């Protein structure tokens, strides 16, 4: 309140509010995550405290965490525009696809980063996604609420994550790129998980071992069939169709890593190009 310039309400996210700032002293425009309650426990303190050294050229870089009075909040590298944006700014044309690959090759490696120290993101959209002038994509956020982009296994109520529920939700971002419609506009639990059934099949014993016991799986789920994926995303080639389905597999444990994802042939002729960007 004393150190930052507030320049302007970027948004709220889940755990506060966003404003792009500039640092009274050293002049940086940052962005600045005021963080809303009972004092500010412990835990998170530490927990927060951790992701200072999590850094990588994908990982949007948290600069400064300030825990003042009873307050919280999260300083980071402010970055120009998000992927929802520039999608929105996209829609005519679609974004060219030598792009689409290189920000998906780029966030597997944040996500490859992240996920070799154990750390998940747990929410990724596209309002998380963020873009600069030179052609990189960084993820943003380690800590009414849109669910077109959750894992299944977290929907049907499995308490542990793992890394899997990230793939699943570049998988559907990568969609969404490719396609201008989100993949699983869902509007609450029930219609985002039978939109998900709906287009990969409901899912049974064979596909999901376990699926069955899950705490909110229930022998009454309508049981749809698969449909085929050619129809899901035209006009994805077949390295790129092949790679989404391994991204998207119900059962968490055969969905691809984040690192083998890397190793698919799809990125053999990856490149970085520049986008246009309006400011
Ligand atoms: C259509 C006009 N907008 C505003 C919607 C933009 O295109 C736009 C958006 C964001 C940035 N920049 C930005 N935003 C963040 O967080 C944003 C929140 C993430 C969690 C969900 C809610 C939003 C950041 N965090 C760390 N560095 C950040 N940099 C620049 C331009």
Redesign the pocket.
Known sequence: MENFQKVEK?????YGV?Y?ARNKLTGEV??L?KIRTEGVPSTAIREISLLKELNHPNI?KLLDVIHTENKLYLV???????L???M?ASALTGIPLPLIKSYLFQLLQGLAFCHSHRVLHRDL?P??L?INTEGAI?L??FGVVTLWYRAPEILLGCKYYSTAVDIWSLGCIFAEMVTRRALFPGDSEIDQLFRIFRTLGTPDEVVWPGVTSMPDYKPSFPKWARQDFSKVVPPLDEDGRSLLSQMLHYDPNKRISAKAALAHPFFQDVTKPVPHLR?
């Open positions: 970027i948004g709220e996210g889940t966003v792009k940052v962005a995550k949007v980071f590298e402010f970055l120009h525009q998000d929802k944006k520039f929105d959209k309002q998380n963020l960084k943003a956020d400011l």
